[PDB]
Amino acid sequence: HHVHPLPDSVPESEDLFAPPPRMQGKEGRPKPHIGPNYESYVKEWAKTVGPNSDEWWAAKARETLDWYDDFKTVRAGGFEHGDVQWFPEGTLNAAYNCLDRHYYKNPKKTAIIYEADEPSESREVSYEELMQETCRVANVLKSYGVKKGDAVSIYLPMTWQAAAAFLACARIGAIHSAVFAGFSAESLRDRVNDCECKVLITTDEGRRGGKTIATKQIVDAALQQCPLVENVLVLRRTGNKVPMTEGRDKWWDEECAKMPAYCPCERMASEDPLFILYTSKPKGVVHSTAGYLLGTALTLKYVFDAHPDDRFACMADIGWITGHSYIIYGPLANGITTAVFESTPVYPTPSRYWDFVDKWKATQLYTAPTAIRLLRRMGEDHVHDLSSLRVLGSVGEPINPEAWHWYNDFAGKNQCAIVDTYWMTETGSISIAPLPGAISTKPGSATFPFFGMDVDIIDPQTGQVLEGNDVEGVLVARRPWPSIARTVYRDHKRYLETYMKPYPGYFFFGDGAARDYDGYMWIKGRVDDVINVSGHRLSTAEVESALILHKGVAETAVVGCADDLTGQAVYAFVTMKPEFDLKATKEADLSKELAIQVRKVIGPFAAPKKIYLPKTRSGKIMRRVLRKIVAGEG
Amino acid sequence: HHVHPLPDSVPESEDLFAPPPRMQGKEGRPKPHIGPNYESYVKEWAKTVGPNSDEWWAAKARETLDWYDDFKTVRAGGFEHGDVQWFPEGTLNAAYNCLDRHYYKNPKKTAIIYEADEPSESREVSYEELMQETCRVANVLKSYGVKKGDAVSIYLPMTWQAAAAFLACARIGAIHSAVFAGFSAESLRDRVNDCECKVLITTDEGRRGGKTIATKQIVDAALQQCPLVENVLVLRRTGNKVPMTEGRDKWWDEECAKMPAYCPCERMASEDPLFILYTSGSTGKPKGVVHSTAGYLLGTALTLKYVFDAHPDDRFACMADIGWITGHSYIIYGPLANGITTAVFESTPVYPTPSRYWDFVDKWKATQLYTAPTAIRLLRRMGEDHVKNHDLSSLRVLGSVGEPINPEAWHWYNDFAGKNQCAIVDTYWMTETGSISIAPLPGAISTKPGSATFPFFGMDVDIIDPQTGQVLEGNDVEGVLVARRPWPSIARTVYRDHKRYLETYMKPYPGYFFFGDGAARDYDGYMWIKGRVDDVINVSGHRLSTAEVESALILHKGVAETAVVGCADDLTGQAVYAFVTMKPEFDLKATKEADLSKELAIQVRKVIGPFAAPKKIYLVSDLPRSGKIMRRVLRKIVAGEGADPQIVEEVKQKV
Amino acid sequence: RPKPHIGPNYESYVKEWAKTVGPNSDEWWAAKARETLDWYDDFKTVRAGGFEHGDVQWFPEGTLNAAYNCLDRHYYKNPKKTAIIYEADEPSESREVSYEELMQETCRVANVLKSYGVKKGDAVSIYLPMTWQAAAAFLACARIGAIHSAVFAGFSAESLRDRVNDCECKVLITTDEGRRGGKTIATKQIVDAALQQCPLVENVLVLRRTGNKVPMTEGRDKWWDEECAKMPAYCPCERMASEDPLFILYTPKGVVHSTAGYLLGTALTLKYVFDAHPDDRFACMADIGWITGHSYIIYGPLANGITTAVFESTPVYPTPSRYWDFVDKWKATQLYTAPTARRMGHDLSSLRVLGSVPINPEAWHWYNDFAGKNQCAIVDTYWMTETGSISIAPLPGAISTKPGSATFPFFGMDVDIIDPQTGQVLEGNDVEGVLVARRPWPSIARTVYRDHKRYLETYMKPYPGYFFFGDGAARDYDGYMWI
Ligand SMILES: CCNS(=O)(=O)NC[C@H]1O[C@@H](n2cnc3c(N)ncnc32)[C@H](O)[C@@H]1O
Ligand SMILES: CCNS(=O)(=O)NC[C@H]1O[C@@H](n2cnc3c(N)ncnc32)[C@H](O)[C@@H]1O
Numbered sequence A: 001h002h003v004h005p006l007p008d009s010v011p012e013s014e015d016l017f018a019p020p021p022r023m024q025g026k027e028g029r030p031k032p033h034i035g036p037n038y039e040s041y042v043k044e045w046a047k048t049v050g051p052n053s054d055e056w057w058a059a060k061a062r063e064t065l066d067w068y069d070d071f072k073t074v075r076a077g078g079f080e081h082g083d084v085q086w087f088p089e090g091t092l093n094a095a096y097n098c099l100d101r102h103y104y105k106n107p108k109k110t111a112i113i114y115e116a117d118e119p120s121e122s123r124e125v126s127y128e129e130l131m132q133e134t135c136r137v138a139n140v141l142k143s144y145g146v147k148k149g150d151a152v153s154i155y156l157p158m159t160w161q162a163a164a165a166f167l168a169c170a171r172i173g174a175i176h177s178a179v180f181a182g183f184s185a186e187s188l189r190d191r192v193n194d195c196e197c198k199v200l201i202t203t204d205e206g207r208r209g210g211k212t213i214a215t216k217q218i219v220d221a222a223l224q225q226c227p228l229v230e231n232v233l234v235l236r237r238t239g240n241k242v243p244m245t246e247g248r249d250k251w252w253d254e255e256c257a258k259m260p261a262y263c264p265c266e267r268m269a270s271e272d273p274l275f276i277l278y279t280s281k282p283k284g285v286v287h288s289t290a291g292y293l294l295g296t297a298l299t300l301k302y303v304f305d306a307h308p309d310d311r312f313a314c315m316a317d318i319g320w321i322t323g324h325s326y327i328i329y330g331p332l333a334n335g336i337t338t339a340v341f342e343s344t345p346v347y348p349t350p351s352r353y354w355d356f357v358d359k360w361k362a363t364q365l366y367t368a369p370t371a372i373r374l375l376r377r378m379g380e381d382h383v384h385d386l387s388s389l390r391v392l393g394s395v396g397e398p399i400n401p402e403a404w405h406w407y408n409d410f411a412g413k414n415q416c417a418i419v420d421t422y423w424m425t426e427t428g429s430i431s432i433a434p435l436p437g438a439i440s441t442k443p444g445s446a447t448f449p450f451f452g453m454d455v456d457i458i459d460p461q462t463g464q465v466l467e468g469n470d471v472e473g474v475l476v477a478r479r480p481w482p483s484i485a486r487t488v489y490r491d492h493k494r495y496l497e498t499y500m501k502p503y504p505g506y507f508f509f510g511d512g513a514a515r516d517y518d519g520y521m522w523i524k525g526r527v528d529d530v531i532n533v534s535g536h537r538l539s540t541a542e543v544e545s546a547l548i549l550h551k552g553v554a555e556t557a558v559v560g561c562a563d564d565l566t567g568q569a570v571y572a573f574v575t576m577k578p579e580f581d582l583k584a585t586k587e588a589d590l591s592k593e594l595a596i597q598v599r600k601v602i603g604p605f606a607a608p609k610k611i612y613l614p615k616t617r618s619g620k621i622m623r624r625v626l627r628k629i630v631a632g633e634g
Numbered sequence B: 001h002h003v004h005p006l007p008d009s010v011p012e013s014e015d016l017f018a019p020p021p022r023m024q025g026k027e028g029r030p031k032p033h034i035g036p037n038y039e040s041y042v043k044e045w046a047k048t049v050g051p052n053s054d055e056w057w058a059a060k061a062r063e064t065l066d067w068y069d070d071f072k073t074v075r076a077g078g079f080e081h082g083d084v085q086w087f088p089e090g091t092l093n094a095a096y097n098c099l100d101r102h103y104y105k106n107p108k109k110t111a112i113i114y115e116a117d118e119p120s121e122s123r124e125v126s127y128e129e130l131m132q133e134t135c136r137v138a139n140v141l142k143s144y145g146v147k148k149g150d151a152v153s154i155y156l157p158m159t160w161q162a163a164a165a166f167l168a169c170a171r172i173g174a175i176h177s178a179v180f181a182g183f184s185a186e187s188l189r190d191r192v193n194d195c196e197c198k199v200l201i202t203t204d205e206g207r208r209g210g211k212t213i214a215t216k217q218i219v220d221a222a223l224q225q226c227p228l229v230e231n232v233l234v235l236r237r238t239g240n241k242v243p244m245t246e247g248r249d250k251w252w253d254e255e256c257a258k259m260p261a262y263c264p265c266e267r268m269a270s271e272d273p274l275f276i277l278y279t280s281g282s283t284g285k286p287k288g289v290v291h292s293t294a295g296y297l298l299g300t301a302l303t304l305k306y307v308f309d310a311h312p313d314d315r316f317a318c319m320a321d322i323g324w325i326t327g328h329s330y331i332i333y334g335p336l337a338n339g340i341t342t343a344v345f346e347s348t349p350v351y352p353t354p355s356r357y358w359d360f361v362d363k364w365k366a367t368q369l370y371t372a373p374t375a376i377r378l379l380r381r382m383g384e385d386h387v388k389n390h391d392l393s394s395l396r397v398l399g400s401v402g403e404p405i406n407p408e409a410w411h412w413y414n415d416f417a418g419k420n421q422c423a424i425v426d427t428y429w430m431t432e433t434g435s436i437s438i439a440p441l442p443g444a445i446s447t448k449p450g451s452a453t454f455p456f457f458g459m460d461v462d463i464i465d466p467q468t469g470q471v472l473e474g475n476d477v478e479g480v481l482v483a484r485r486p487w488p489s490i491a492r493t494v495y496r497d498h499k500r501y502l503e504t505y506m507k508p509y510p511g512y513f514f515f516g517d518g519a520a521r522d523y524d525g526y527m528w529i530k531g532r533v534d535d536v537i538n539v540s541g542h543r544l545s546t547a548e549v550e551s552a553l554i555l556h557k558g559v560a561e562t563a564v565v566g567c568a569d570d571l572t573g574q575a576v577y578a579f580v581t582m583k584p585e586f587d588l589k590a591t592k593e594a595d596l597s598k599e600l601a602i603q604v605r606k607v608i609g610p611f612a613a614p615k616k617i618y619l620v621s622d623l624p625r626s627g628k629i630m631r632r633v634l635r636k637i638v639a640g641e642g643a644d645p646q647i648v649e650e651v652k653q654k655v
Numbered sequence C: 001r002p003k004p005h006i007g008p009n010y011e012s013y014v015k016e017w018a019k020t021v022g023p024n025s026d027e028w029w030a031a032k033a034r035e036t037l038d039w040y041d042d043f044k045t046v047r048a049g050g051f052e053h054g055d056v057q058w059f060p061e062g063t064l065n066a067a068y069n070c071l072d073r074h075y076y077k078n079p080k081k082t083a084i085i086y087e088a089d090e091p092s093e094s095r096e097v098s099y100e101e102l103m104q105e106t107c108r109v110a111n112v113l114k115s116y117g118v119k120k121g122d123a124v125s126i127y128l129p130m131t132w133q134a135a136a137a138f139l140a141c142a143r144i145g146a147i148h149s150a151v152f153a154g155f156s157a158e159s160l161r162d163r164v165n166d167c168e169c170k171v172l173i174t175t176d177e178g179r180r181g182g183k184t185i186a187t188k189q190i191v192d193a194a195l196q197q198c199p200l201v202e203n204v205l206v207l208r209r210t211g212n213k214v215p216m217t218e219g220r221d222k223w224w225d226e227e228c229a230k231m232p233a234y235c236p237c238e239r240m241a242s243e244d245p246l247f248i249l250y251t252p253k254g255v256v257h258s259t260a261g262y263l264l265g266t267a268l269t270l271k272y273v274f275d276a277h278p279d280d281r282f283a284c285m286a287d288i289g290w291i292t293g294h295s296y297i298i299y300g301p302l303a304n305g306i307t308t309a310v311f312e313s314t315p316v317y318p319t320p321s322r323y324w325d326f327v328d329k330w331k332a333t334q335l336y337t338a339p340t341a342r343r344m345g346h347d348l349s350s351l352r353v354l355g356s357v358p359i360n361p362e363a364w365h366w367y368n369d370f371a372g373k374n375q376c377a378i379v380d381t382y383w384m385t386e387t388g389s390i391s392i393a394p395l396p397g398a399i400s401t402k403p404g405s406a407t408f409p410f411f412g413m414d415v416d417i418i419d420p421q422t423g424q425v426l427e428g429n430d431v432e433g434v435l436v437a438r439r440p441w442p443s444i445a446r447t448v449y450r451d452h453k454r455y456l457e458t459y460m461k462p463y464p465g466y467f468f469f470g471d472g473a474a475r476d477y478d479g480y481m482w483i
């Protein structure tokens, strides 16, 4: 075969895992929504793409969400000019769909499982409580003069009120712009100025893993160069003394105590913007209302097989798109229970995830590879019952197949489906992932595209589509889907040039990908991280997966630097486990073993020329820093 | 029985009055909506409360009002957090329901009977004229930058244009805040700043009882300490010279002449706030009671239709002032929503003479009259010569609101205003309830002097023992009044002071709404509201209402009005002190002042008991704007402290 | 040739015109209102109000948007159809603009205006020549509920200063220069002169029609193409009430038109007076600065979903044949031109209906033979800014017409003539007097901006309960009108 899976130590013939009995109608668990096999997924999927799929999408939009005004047109527009429209004549409100309509049905049902940094301080927040808090904040924002279409910055740690602040903006038609609680003032400042907001929502302090985040202190520093901000609403998270500027700053609880506990919903057009989410000038990705909300609702229901009594535990941060979609909007739209985890996976112990799972009988767990490195690395003594789990998800970057099996074995007792979810901030919702009740998985593969996603592979050297299977190139989408980002805030040109110009006719994700002989999709990393050695273009995922097969390796990152005899050369930056003895295995001897590992697993063309990690707050490895340093640019 | 009715001079067996023939469909009058007996009231009422009342309320909401968008949910929320919701997904506009839809049906039907202070200046205002005036003001407010949800203060006397100012704000989604024309600048200023409005609507002057109110003069004084006000719209009521600040102030007639006579309606969510009505209440600051749109509007429409048995051609004569909740609900919103004729009375009941009410009724053939006990007592003091020589046959329902009505005043009302041929409706409610809470349905309920009787549709009230916090099951019980579940017209908050809203009405008896009134349900199930809990007097363990001691006093020949307050007493805890006003004709020389007092105390001792007999009686000329007697002032005077500051000194002298 | 909608004799035009007036006048206007336009919300009341107090209302409860009805709905049905034929001043610079392209430009501009804080109900002034982006400007203002005030591109800086200050607009849309009859119309120069005394105007959007160097006030002035490059190509439509104002057109008498009425009147007149059909190519040579360009270049044609022409030249540039080179080059199917234009000195078989807007009666024969070849129709049209849509015209495939007259007044308008000395209408035929109208029509102007007083003292108070046109008119034994 031309297309190889990510290097793994397990035979390929033993790496095809069918839906287990928990994802079958047995053991008293809900029968899957889609199942039991690959053909059942394809049968439904073919209704969601092609020239006769408007029928399916209209029904799903009318069944999934509540509308104030029906829509007439299902879809229009396209990539070339970026005029994407879905359900354009309809009106709705995101807070009505995430709060009110469930409050009216079961007001005492739990909406948020607030897992505080300290396990003792945790509690359940009901749809009644969350709605009242949202409506109070919404009334406060209106009293500040916030109007439909105004931007509101949010700088909140993972306390449950963060959901109320997001939904308060959506309730009144404001455009919330979340900034990870922990970015520098320079990062907070740039995002506040770009969106031109006049109101900022934040806390006095945060708490994560026992540490103290000086959110208010950072804000005051950033706001010295954010001229337009006139109002700041400070949640009293800790109560510890923080500076409160007179007039500009007010306490959340004092402001809310003056306001009523209900607020009307602003009737929003489908294409009114719901939020701006900046990405690390800053790129403010803009999502509209109806299509984004429907995408998050549909993906949560099918990719995680969500059922009414489920308790969904996404361990990400609301400052990132994974929090937007699968902590707040997705789960609350489906009306289930969602987790807001304010701690780290290592506090009080590396068993918090598992203590959390057993304490709350969580039905799905959704975290990232960068955190997955933690648990499997430190010890499986930390891994409990975990029987409540039924679907396990991973998001953020390629998952080395080695981490994949531990996830299947110890967290799932070989009884959970593992869903590797591929998507971007700009897709809004999950693009390629297995439906747990239908798809037999492979370690390290995203598998098949989700409803509405018609993806293909393009040879970047010819610009043409590679027909068939067992092909490799760059991933592109053929048609718009409802949750696609609609622009980059006040910079539509950057939007078109980045995603719509590189391969005209298609959307360009920016990732290398391959479709193997079985049709399974494999995402191998950024195209900008590809290294071309003597005509062999190498992905960062395959070299880094082969390295992690050597004893003692924890995490790696390979970058390319120019080479006069091979064009570029692979340079690998390697991190070792703490117990590993660097004296027994000399650094020169370690590199020799690693280069032989890569040569054996990939080929001589891939052997690193030199072996020696800078990571953003989102958990991503800053490979652009490793590349420039190797060249000698400070 | 343990529960006694308010003192009356008629035997209890002879003091139950069944709907007269005018409310039996006879004499050419329209058949009542509910009737003909108590059972017909209960049959409908039981559809309006309980866990299966959503069906009735959904239907009445869709039958009574015109909606731009239908609603899905009927009710949600509750007392505990103050998140009451009614018809939340629906949209409508109050001005469309009060003007446009009736204009489109019968544009020339009369909307307002404008009874000016001078009777010669009175005229009829049709729905077309009022709609056009409303739309001109709305355009004027919008030209000023007024947006949906902004507060607009109104300081207007009782001229018909006051309705156009209220409905102009409602038409564009502004929040109107009315201030009684006659409050001091100090009271106006507090209300203008609290609601944070930028636009004020007022007159150059007012006219009441022959006097001239210098509204603009008061306004200018108030606005020197109102930094947020940017625009003032001055109706040209008198034409006498007033100071007009350049730019800030503009003439109503000049501004409106520039605008079109139509304006689109703002589509409002049911729960968007419709108005703020401040009350000089509780203490310290003014309490801005906030009502939302759909539930308030539906509450006033339904109460007017059933409590006053309103039919399409009726001519409803509420003699209250639009600066108070009775004016909001039963001059403007209630009647105009029902599409009938409503009266705007610019005079007093004694100007030019005490026959004004009755001249008005016959002049316009009014079909229902709605006034207060303070005016019934006032007229009753001036003589039956001014009321005896009138027809008054057009009337068929007479209403009383504001406080408990003494059975003596009740009988004067029934005898001379209704000629024993009208139904008397005693309406109990508050600013905070939005609409009538407890009252008799005139075609169905047999009344008792001084009793409101039974709760209105949607009101499920109870009596609570304030010392046990428990509901007193059964009849012949006494305590404080409470409501069990929200109703559609309940106030939704206190403007920017939700804590004051929860603390005042929702915390004192958790699970309930606390009216603040003592109440009792007699053996027949009739409810009796006898006065504020803060006004109770306790003599040797006997908790006394001010209404029952004052009802017993007024049974003595010559008594016009009384006021009793409690004073501390070392041997009985408190003691009753009574302040008495007599009729003009009564001779103080024939019956010495001391001998009169003894007869009064013996009256109370006989009817209530010696513990209620006043220890001392002060004969005054008058008692100390809403028509309420300032008993808190008389209480402080008898203790030793220190609308008209002259009576206050007059009291201090006799005391 | 497609069959005309109304025909073939008068009894077909009496059975129809009898429905647009009278007691059941409502039932007909209600059907047409629902059939012609797309509504976001239905309407309950057909008509209310009258001339007396100036409270005219049509379809008050309904909501809608002019851009959705002139762009989106046709885009969704056939996006590549040509909405505009842009006949540049230089004939070889002409090109077709599709509904898609026209929609995307409108949405961009609409997004720009929103970034400047323009809100529903705000005023925006438009100082543009007859380039095709003028319709995108009009419709971008309508798309967001903003009130556009079109000021003809030839007006002086003084006349623009006055029109911009009356409407109180905070945003102005102009070009850097114009082009007409081979000449250059310095519009930004005139814009900078006037604005020195326009204290409310805070943002100006300048379209590069020539690229020539012009002054740009930093901060206030921004380039159209640079501002629009930052915005998405879709914008939501504001849900407007029928009686929300759509535009101000000063004659400083700023005539105001509501939305659903003016739009219904414009759509119906094109579909009948000119007998427009789906594939027709309506050519109107007016300017978007006047009510002729508003109603029969932009709103009427783009509402019916046909093709309309934006003619940027004169009738004699390059040569007096331009109309007829125009007509054959694009196969125009209707022609609409002024009185001004057989004195300075082609196939044309595609023309089917020909109209003007008084013309000497010999021009009626010349316009029927040299332009029609005794195979075309001829429709004469009189009206004014305050009427919203053409008032007096004959229906083409039904009514046998005569030179100089107009057979019958348009659907839903019933006029008469008053004796200016007795103030009594002269019933009957063979009469003369001052022209006035009876009852309300949908497209009637609703006020004069912030001078409803003048609105009454000019058209309502002069003759009680009537609309006073201000021009003398006469009727003859044939039931025909003369201005
Ligand atoms: C939506 C989360 N955004 S993200 O967490 O910022 N991820 C950063 C970037 O990593 C890539 N990516 C995401 N998920 C996967 C995956 N499962 N396998 C391989 N690659 C992946 C995408 O290009 C994304 O833009
Ligand atoms: C809507 C009235 N507004 S009011 O004029 O402000 N009345 C002041 C307060 O008096 C009490 N009250 C009112 N009506 C009655 C009545 N009929 N019998 C006994 N008590 C009554 C209420 O607590 C009210 O709030």
Ligand SMILES: [Cl-]
Pocket (backbone or CB within 6 Å): A017, A018, A019, A020, A416, A417, A418, A439, A440, A441
């Ligand atoms: Cl699996």
